[PDB]
A paper describes a structure:
As an important step towards this goal, we have exploited the plasticity and stability of artificial 7 kDa affinity proteins (Affitins) derived from extremophilic proteins, such as DNA-binding protein 7d (Sac7d), which are found in various Archaea such as Sulfolobus, Acidianus, and Metallospharea genera. As a proof of concept that Affitins may inhibit different glycosidases specifically, we used these libraries (L3 and L4) and those we had previously designed without an extended loop (L1 and L2) to select Affitins specific for the inverting endo-glycosidase [name] from [name] (EC 3.2.1.4). We also analyzed an Affitin specific for the well-studied (retaining endo-glycosidase) HEWL (EC 3.2.1.17) previously selected from the library L1. To analyze interactions at the atomic level, the crystal structures of the [name]-E12, [name]-H3 and HEWL-H4 complexes were determined at 1.1, 1.6 and 1.5 Å resolution, respectively.
E12 and H3 Affitins, which are derived from libraries with a longer and randomized loop 2, present a protruding convex region that penetrates the catalytic cleft of [name], thereby validating our strategy to use an extended randomized loop. E12 and H3 Affitins in complex with [name] displayed a similar interaction with an average buried surface area of 1317 Å2 and an Affitin contribution of 707 and 717 Å2, respectively. In both cases, the Affitins bound the enzyme by inserting the protruding extended loop into the active site while the β-sheet 2 rested on the [name] surface. Additionally, the loop presented a charged residue that interacted via salt-bridges with those involved in the catalytic reaction. For the [name]-H3 complex, the overall positioning of the Affitin onto [name] was similar. However, some contacts were different from those observed for the [name]-E12 complex. For example, Arg29 formed salt-bridges with other catalytically important residues (Asp198 and Asp201). The motif Leu-Thr/Ser-Lys inside the extended loop was conserved, except in Affitin H3, where Leu was changed to Asn and Lys to Arg, although the latter implies a conservation of positive charge at this position. The Ki for the anti-[name] binders was determined as 111 nM for H3 and 95 nM for E12, while for the anti-HEWL binder a Ki value of 45 nM was obtained. Thermal stabilities of E12 and H3 Affitins determined by differential scanning calorimetry (DSC) analysis were of 81.1°C and 76.1°C, respectively.
Author numbering:
A (entry chain B): 1 to 7, 12 to 67
B (entry chain A): 34 to 577
Amino acid sequence: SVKVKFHEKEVDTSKIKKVWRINTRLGMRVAFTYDDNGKTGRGMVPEKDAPKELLDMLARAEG
Amino acid sequence: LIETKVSAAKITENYQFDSRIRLNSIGFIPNHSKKATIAANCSTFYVVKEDGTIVYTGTATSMFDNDTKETVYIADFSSVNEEGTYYLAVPGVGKSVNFKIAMNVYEDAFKTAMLGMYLLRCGTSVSATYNGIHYSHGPCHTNDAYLDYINGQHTKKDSTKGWHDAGDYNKYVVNAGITVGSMFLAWEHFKDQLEPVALEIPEKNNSIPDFLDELKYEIDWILTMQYPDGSGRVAHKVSTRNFGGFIMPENEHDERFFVPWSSAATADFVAMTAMAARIFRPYDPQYAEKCINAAKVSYEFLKNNPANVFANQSGFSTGEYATVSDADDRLWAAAEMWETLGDEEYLRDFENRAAQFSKKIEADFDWDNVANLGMFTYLLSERPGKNPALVQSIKDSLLSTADSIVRTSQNHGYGRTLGTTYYWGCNGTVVRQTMILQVANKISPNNDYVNAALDAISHVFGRNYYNRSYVTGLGINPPMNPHDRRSGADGIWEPWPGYLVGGGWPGPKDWVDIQDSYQTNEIAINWNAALIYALAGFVNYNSP
Ligand SMILES: [Ca+2]
Ligand SMILES: [Ca+2]
Ligand SMILES: [Ca+2]
Ligand SMILES: [Zn+2]
């Protein structure tokens, strides 16, 4: 598992719950929910910018 | 043998507003559906005139809202048709806000959504007084725009005018596409309703219908986006390099640039200018000729260059609006060229493309997926020559889709036409679904379609989990803190009026009315355009 940097916050992939792809007004993003001290947070990163580990989770979720 | 009615009864005035009673805070139309969602155990309810007189007694029915995972109680008071001001009184719970029943109930809201567009204008000072509050800014972005990224030369070519897109001030062709197409289809679909409408705009005394004046302000910008080389390629956007701060737009002095072309922007330009040509011709035929000649230049480019091309947005970090495919955009362009001009080549282009869509009509659509616009214009055209089997395939899908939206709204605890689907901008899509419903109603008149459109409208005006209007300046407890630069930067507590906020996601409770939330609480032309279409159908409308 690796750290996901997003706008600047850092989330370990081990904390991520759901991952999905969205074409937003800002560009293609990989969106996700994650565990934040027992609450659920939402984040997103540019697809071009996502680590291999997050992109693998997306591929699994999409398969 | 003998029947005499009991006297009308009046309410005791101890009823207090309760936030669990959720309904359309603007109101209702005679002869149409009228519902409230009561998120509390209850049975009896009364519809009460503002003076206390009870006009209707009903029983609320329990329903499971799978979206919020709660049992709610539905009060159906559709049979109340007398015009007036009322509230719902729910013994054991409280009362709703006051609402109106009127044939013209939505006209002020329509005018306010139109005001929002006026107030988004770029390149000019804007000024309006709204509920006694003066909103204004000086002339902005008057140096639009430079050609450095197009041809390497730091040459200015006029690219002023148009609308600021969102909470940022940049101007994006692809998002203009669905915005302008949806507003132009409001004009075509509801022309006799909208033609006489007077708006609070500077153009209120010229010879052009005011709805079209607003659109002309955008088309005037769109027309500037073709490449100066004469190729017909269309620049993707006019933008600063990065998103600026929360400043008034006349204080934004950073240079703005044309951004390299995309095939989708080029196709969207064709569709918008082809529509503009037929729509403006009765009022400004010189402008109409300009529009159609421009459309033709760009369509020739697209015919000779069939590939999907994404804009090269290197150097920019503002909105991308990088639609994944231009196939829908090109279908729409062909439809509009055909509708305006009639040539067999356009018809053949459209029909060949339309046949490749397995599902002809999609329930959930926005800037990225504009094929519905072409399907609508083709289906509704009075021109001869259409392939009968394609027409039938499109009709079947339109009606199947519309019937599904009715089923969604009927089985949702808050009448949400988009069901359990949430994403960035989804509030826009809720109301944009009214296009499918109204087009279905033209093809196969069905009250369920029109009532479902009113369920979409009701949803964004307070029949929702939050018990809030999603439109600045209107209805119950509207958004106060949109991600909107003018709102953030001016000296006024209330935000700029008339804007549909984007909506919460991924869930039904995820909307946050906080300025930092561009994800859930921004504004956008494509969202307003959807609201405008939705409300347009109920302007100068008589339901008898
Ligand atoms: Ca006018
Ligand atoms: Ca597209
Ligand atoms: Ca303010
Ligand atoms: Zn401006």
